[PDB]
Design an enzyme around this catalytic site. Structure first.
Site, PDB file in Angstrom:
ATOM      1  N   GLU A 165       0.871  -1.223   0.000  1.00  0.00           N
ATOM      2  CA  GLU A 165       0.000   0.000   0.000  1.00  0.00           C
ATOM      3  C   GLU A 165       0.888   1.247   0.000  1.00  0.00           C
ATOM      4  OE1 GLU A 165      -2.976   0.229  -0.742  1.00  0.00           O
ATOM      5  OE2 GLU A 165      -3.985  -1.653  -0.233  1.00  0.00           O
ATOM      6  N   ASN A 198      -7.178   7.911  -6.394  1.00  0.00           N
ATOM      7  CA  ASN A 198      -7.927   6.798  -7.023  1.00  0.00           C
ATOM      8  C   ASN A 198      -8.639   7.350  -8.270  1.00  0.00           C
ATOM      9  OD1 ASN A 198      -8.660   5.985  -3.663  1.00  0.00           O
ATOM     10  ND2 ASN A 198      -7.207   4.884  -4.945  1.00  0.00           N
ATOM     11  N   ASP A 245     -11.681   7.086  -8.969  1.00  0.00           N
ATOM     12  CA  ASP A 245     -13.030   7.586  -8.609  1.00  0.00           C
ATOM     13  C   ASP A 245     -12.941   9.014  -8.037  1.00  0.00           C
ATOM     14  OD1 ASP A 245     -12.195   7.172  -6.103  1.00  0.00           O
ATOM     15  OD2 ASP A 245     -13.799   5.789  -5.488  1.00  0.00           O
ATOM     16  N   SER A 262     -11.397   9.850  -5.207  1.00  0.00           N
ATOM     17  CA  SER A 262     -10.964   9.672  -3.809  1.00  0.00           C
ATOM     18  C   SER A 262      -9.426   9.588  -3.785  1.00  0.00           C
ATOM     19  CB  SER A 262     -11.634   8.515  -3.184  1.00  0.00           C
ATOM     20  OG  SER A 262     -11.171   7.299  -3.672  1.00  0.00           O
ATOM     21  N   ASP A 297      -6.181   7.825  -1.241  1.00  0.00           N
ATOM     22  CA  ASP A 297      -5.774   6.933  -0.146  1.00  0.00           C
ATOM     23  C   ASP A 297      -4.609   7.522   0.629  1.00  0.00           C
ATOM     24  OD1 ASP A 297      -7.597   5.049  -1.088  1.00  0.00           O
ATOM     25  OD2 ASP A 297      -6.083   3.621  -1.728  1.00  0.00           O
ATOM     26  N   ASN A 335      -8.956   5.225   2.530  1.00  0.00           N
ATOM     27  CA  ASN A 335      -9.654   5.846   1.402  1.00  0.00           C
ATOM     28  C   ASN A 335     -10.610   6.938   1.896  1.00  0.00           C
ATOM     29  OD1 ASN A 335     -12.072   5.813  -0.707  1.00  0.00           O
ATOM     30  ND2 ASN A 335     -10.112   5.334  -1.685  1.00  0.00           N
ATOM     31  N   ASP A 367     -15.788  -4.528   9.313  1.00  0.00           N
ATOM     32  CA  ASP A 367     -17.069  -4.058   8.708  1.00  0.00           C
ATOM     33  C   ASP A 367     -17.723  -5.149   7.847  1.00  0.00           C
ATOM     34  OD1 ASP A 367     -16.092  -4.235   6.167  1.00  0.00           O
ATOM     35  OD2 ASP A 367     -16.076  -2.040   5.819  1.00  0.00           O
TER      36      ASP A 367
END
Ligand code: CL
Ligand code: NA
Ligand code: NA
Length: 129
Positions: free
Chosen positions: A35, A46, A48, A50, A52, A59, A101
């Site tokens: 990562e 990202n 989209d 977003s 990180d 994110n 989650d």
């Protein structure tokens, strides 16, 4: 801060990630290497829109607020910038909510593609834990 492999293993163990939701320490160290390259200051955009943030590439779409991710949540109730500190507390606290989650560590693309189904114990070989 750029951690050494065994230095970050030790930090993660002290913050209670070893065997957290059943994920052994090597899983977290492998995830962090791929990562962030063990760099607390790592940020990556990202597709989209977003971003990180930090050692575990948390994110902004769901977990932290960076003020530029439309339609996003802040489920860890932290500014994304607070996840870039040399102290990994905030990233670990947030990672424990993510992995709890339902999807486990599959939330982390690098873990799914590069650590899952591998000998992750290699990542903590030689380390004083
Ligand atoms: Cl799981
Ligand atoms: Na957000
Ligand atoms: Na090697």
């Amino acid at each position: 801060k750029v951690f050494g492999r065994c230095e970050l293993a030790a930090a993660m163990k002290r913050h209670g990630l070893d065997n957290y939701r059943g994920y052994s320490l090597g899983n977290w160290v492998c995830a962090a290497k791929f990562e962030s390259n063990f760099n607390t200051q790592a940020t990556n955009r990202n597709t989209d829109g977003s971003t990180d943030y930090g050692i575990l590439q948390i994110n902004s779409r769901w977990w932290c607020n960076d003020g530029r991710t439309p339609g996003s949540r802040n489920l860890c109730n932290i500014p994304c910038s607070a996840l870039l500190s040399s102290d990994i507390t905030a990233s670990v606290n947030c990672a424990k909510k993510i992995v709890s989650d339902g999807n486990g560590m599959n939330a982390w693309v690098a873990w799914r593609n590069r650590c899952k189904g591998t000998d992750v114990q290699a990542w903590i070989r030689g380390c004083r834990l």
